[PDB]
Amino acid sequence: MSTRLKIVTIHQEPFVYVKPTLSDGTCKEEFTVNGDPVKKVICTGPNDTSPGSPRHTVPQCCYGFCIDLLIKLARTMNFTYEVHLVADGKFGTQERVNKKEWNGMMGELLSGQADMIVAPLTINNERAQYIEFSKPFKYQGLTILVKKGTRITGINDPRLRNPSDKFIYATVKQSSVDIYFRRQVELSTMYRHMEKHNYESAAEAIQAVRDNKLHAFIWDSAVLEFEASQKCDLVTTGELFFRSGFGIGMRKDSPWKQNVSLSILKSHENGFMEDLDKTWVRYQ
Amino acid sequence: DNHLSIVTLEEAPFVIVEDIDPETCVRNTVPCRKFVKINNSTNEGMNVKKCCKGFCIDILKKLSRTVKFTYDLYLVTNGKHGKKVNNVWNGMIGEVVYQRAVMAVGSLTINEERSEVVDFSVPFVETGISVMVSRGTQVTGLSDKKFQRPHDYSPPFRFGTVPNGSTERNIRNNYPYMHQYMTKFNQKGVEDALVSLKTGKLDAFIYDAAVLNYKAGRDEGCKLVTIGSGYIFATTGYGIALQKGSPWKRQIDLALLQFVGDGEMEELETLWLTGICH
Ligand SMILES: N#C[C@@H]1C[C@H]1c1c(C(F)(F)F)sc2nc(Cn3nc(C(F)(F)F)cc3Cl)cc(=O)n12
Numbered sequence A: 001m002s003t004r005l006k007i008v009t010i011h012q013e014p015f016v017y018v019k020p021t022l023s024d025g026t027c028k029e030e031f032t033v034n035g036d037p038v039k040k041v042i043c044t045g046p047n048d049t050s051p052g053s054p055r056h057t058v059p060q061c062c063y064g065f066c067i068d069l070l071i072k073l074a075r076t077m078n079f080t081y082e083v084h085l086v087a088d089g090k091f092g093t094q095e096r097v098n099k100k101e102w103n104g105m106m107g108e109l110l111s112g113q114a115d116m117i118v119a120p121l122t123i124n125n126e127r128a129q130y131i132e133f134s135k136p137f138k139y140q141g142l143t144i145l146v147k148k149g150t151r152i153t154g155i156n157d158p159r160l161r162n163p164s165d166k167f168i169y170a171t172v173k174q175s176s177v178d179i180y181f182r183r184q185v186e187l188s189t190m191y192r193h194m195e196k197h198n199y200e201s202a203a204e205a206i207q208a209v210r211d212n213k214l215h216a217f218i219w220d221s222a223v224l225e226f227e228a229s230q231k232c233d234l235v236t237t238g239e240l241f242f243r244s245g246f247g248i249g250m251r252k253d254s255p256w257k258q259n260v261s262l263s264i265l266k267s268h269e270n271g272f273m274e275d276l277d278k279t280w281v282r283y284q
Numbered sequence B: 001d002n003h004l005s006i007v008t009l010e011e012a013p014f015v016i017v018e019d020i021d022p023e024t025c026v027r028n029t030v031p032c033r034k035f036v037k038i039n040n041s042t043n044e045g046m047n048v049k050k051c052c053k054g055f056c057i058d059i060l061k062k063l064s065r066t067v068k069f070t071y072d073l074y075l076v077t078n079g080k081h082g083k084k085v086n087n088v089w090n091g092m093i094g095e096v097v098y099q100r101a102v103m104a105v106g107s108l109t110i111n112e113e114r115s116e117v118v119d120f121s122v123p124f125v126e127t128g129i130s131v132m133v134s135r136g137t138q139v140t141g142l143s144d145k146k147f148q149r150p151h152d153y154s155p156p157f158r159f160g161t162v163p164n165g166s167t168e169r170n171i172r173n174n175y176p177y178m179h180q181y182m183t184k185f186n187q188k189g190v191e192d193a194l195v196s197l198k199t200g201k202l203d204a205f206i207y208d209a210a211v212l213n214y215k216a217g218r219d220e221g222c223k224l225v226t227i228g229s230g231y232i233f234a235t236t237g238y239g240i241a242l243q244k245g246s247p248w249k250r251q252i253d254l255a256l257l258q259f260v261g262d263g264e265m266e267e268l269e270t271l272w273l274t275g276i277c278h
């Protein structure tokens, strides 16, 4: 007897921050640079991130560009919601089991575990085949994150195009970057090097570039540019390749799909989306 | 129901119109018709056979092939892109709304009010609102007090747009004062606007980002530039407009995302949009 929307998100700074709750089950009161209070939501999710391990669901605190967008969408469309973090910690790809199955947030949405995906989820042909994407709430692309000093021209650098156990580069397992390198034959040499060194999450891969375990990390520029502007020991190299958008994920039968997109269009047109970029991305 | 009526509108480099050869359409051009009136005291007119090429036309050719449909392309003669006058849509949007066209292909900006009457495809070109000025002009962007409060300056900053499109609509909705001040600087089109800028008759030209970026990248002497690193306000994209609940939308969305994935899209940007100025 619940018409409350189940929302699935993923930890991905600066879009979704995931911090523990205070001893009393609430979120620490915080403030933006403009003195406004940081809007936070309780997001349930696993504490043990290890693969093939039991998942003990715990309440956590969620905030960021995607949470502010969720709150705006909820107020505008007059719906109630509940936020949980993706049980397996993945964005989502279709993998062969004869049968093919979607994992991550894609898996959760298609199974009815989630009613909506509110995360930096890339719009691509593979996912658009099974789910409805809203109009983009962010246009971005792919770039490389290296340690300051490491010199690369871009995707057309022989240290990448001609791989070797000398220069270890990767992306995130079961993500859109993973789908991109796999579908394109033009990048099969790169993909085969990558598949052996891919990380479970972007945070892990970003720390690996810091703890000298990874040389280059191919990922979303919205995330990477933000990370390079915060951690001055890391810099993004090259321009942008495979320019892509992030959209809200729903099932093809959702009675919200039209109003979700109109709301995103309004927010781009009235400066609300630009304000989110100001508050969460365009700083330091 | 494989032969589709499709509307377009001339806007270089997206859609380029040409006269037919001495006696059909050659090379990368596709046939496109334009209804031309006999006189203005009549409704009588003739469809002139013209040829169409450009970025958006190459996108049409790929969709026609991938999505497997044939078409009859025509140029809109009622409005331009789309304006709601007294609740009646004109331009390319009107053609789709009143079912004279199955789809509109061109430099058509996706916006909320148009989305209420037509279905749009995924955006295939990033656009929005940019500001073109002579290199060196000191303006922060649309939010600059030179635009927002123009009479606070002596003499006041001179700026206009090409009215009746998505840009003016957006300025009308967000900056009421700026909008009512700008209307005396309304430009008949992009070409007039650039001439007024180059001849010191205009200080800034506010318009579609993708068109302004193309124009600065090809400016003779690279004098005219877009503010910021060619910055985009109210970021949006061009989309193919389709009738509401159209069966063609699914196939068209997947093909476009396929074209982006495959590298087919970057090839068109190289072929039509790249410039000399940087
Ligand atoms: N998805 C997708 C398509 C493939 C990617 C894409 C373009 C591509 F060149 F790749 F064809 S150009 C582009 N602009 C925006 C900019 N944009 N457009 C909107 C609008 F559609 F909502 F108006 C909002 C924003 Cl940001 C978003 C976007 O995703 N894309």
Ligand SMILES: N[C@@H](CCC(=O)O)C(=O)O
Residues within 6 Å of the ligand: B081, B082, B107, B108, B109, B110, B162, B163, B164, B165, B166, B167, B168, B207, B208, B209
């Ligand atoms: N591309 C715009 C026209 C140009 C503009 O007004 O920015 C539109 O579809 O209305």
